[PDB]
Amino acid sequence: PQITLWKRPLVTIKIGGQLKEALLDTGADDTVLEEMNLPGRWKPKMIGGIGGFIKVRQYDQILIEICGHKAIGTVLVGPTPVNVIGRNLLTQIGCTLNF
Amino acid sequence: PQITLWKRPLVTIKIGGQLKEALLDTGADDTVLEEMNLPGRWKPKMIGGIGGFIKVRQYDQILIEICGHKAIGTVLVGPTPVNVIGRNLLTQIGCTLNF
Numbered sequence: 001p002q003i004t005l006w007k008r009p010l011v012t013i014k015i016g017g018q019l020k021e022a023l024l025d026t027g028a029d030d031t032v033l034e035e036m037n038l039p040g041r042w043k044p045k046m047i048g049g050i051g052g053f054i055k056v057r058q059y060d061q062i063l064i065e066i067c068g069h070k071a072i073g074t075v076l077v078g079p080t081p082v083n084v085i086g087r088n089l090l091t092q093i094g095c096t097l098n099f
Numbered sequence: 100p101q102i103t104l105w106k107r108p109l110v111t112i113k114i115g116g117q118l119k120e121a122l123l124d125t126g127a128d129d130t131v132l133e134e135m136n137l138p139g140r141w142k143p144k145m146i147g148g149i150g151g152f153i154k155v156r157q158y159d160q161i162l163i164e165i166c167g168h169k170a171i172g173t174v175l176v177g178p179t180p181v182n183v184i185g186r187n188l189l190t191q192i193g194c195t196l197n198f
């Protein structure tokens with residue numbers, strides 16, 4: 001599809017057997033999802049943006065379906081106000097910016 | 100152009116007659132630039148990011164050229180970690196997401 005940017009580019013994702021809403025975010029290097037109790041090992045990470053840093057849990061090789069497009073990669077879990085799909089997964093679904 | 104996302108979508112912008120580098124950021128509603136001098140009236144505002152809220156100077160109706168494409172709109176200036184071009188200006192240059 002083609003998504004215009006008049007409104008936030010929110011899409012439905014499937015991760016860990018749950019459906020959620022997330023931003024297709026070209027400004028995020030990596031994917032960050034709202035707190036959720038995922039099984040498996042993780043490592044702590046600090047990620048920074050406007051307002052400072054938050055502590056997150058880095059899970060590797062997580063399967064995520066984004067608008068019916070499957071991807072697998074790093075997913076950071078923490079107290080983010082928004083689910084954001086970052087470039088590490090956007091590249092996997094064939095997403096480009098165009099103007 | 101069509102921009103892939105294996106690297107950060109960084110582009111050169113012109114604002115206040117000066118060249119800078121900025122990130123095309125579909126996850127940003129607004130455009131936020133690092134501390135700089137800009138002419139004209141500004142009003143204090145607050146904006147929230149992943150890590151909390153920051154004080155910014157809001158400049159309205161500012162000319163800004165993004166990768167050769169002209170826009171006129173609101174630019175927020177403050178202690179952002181990165182110059183981000185947000186949806187208020189991405190829409191003006193006709194930017195869409197595609198996959």
Ligand SMILES: CC(C)CN(C[C@@H](O)[C@H](Cc1ccccc1)NC(=O)O[C@H]1CO[C@H]2OCC[C@H]21)S(=O)(=O)c1ccc(CO)cc1
Nearest residue numbers: 027028029030047048049050082126127128129148149181
């Ligand atoms: C700043 C940028 C370089 C990096 N960020 C992505 C941005 O898209 C961020 C997304 C966002 C955060 C919080 C609420 C809504 C959207 N948008 C944002 O701050 O937008 C500001 C300006 O416009 C307003 O609209 C929405 C908020 C206001 S990040 O989240 O900090 C981040 C940092 C490290 C990683 C791991 O690599 C992943 C993500």
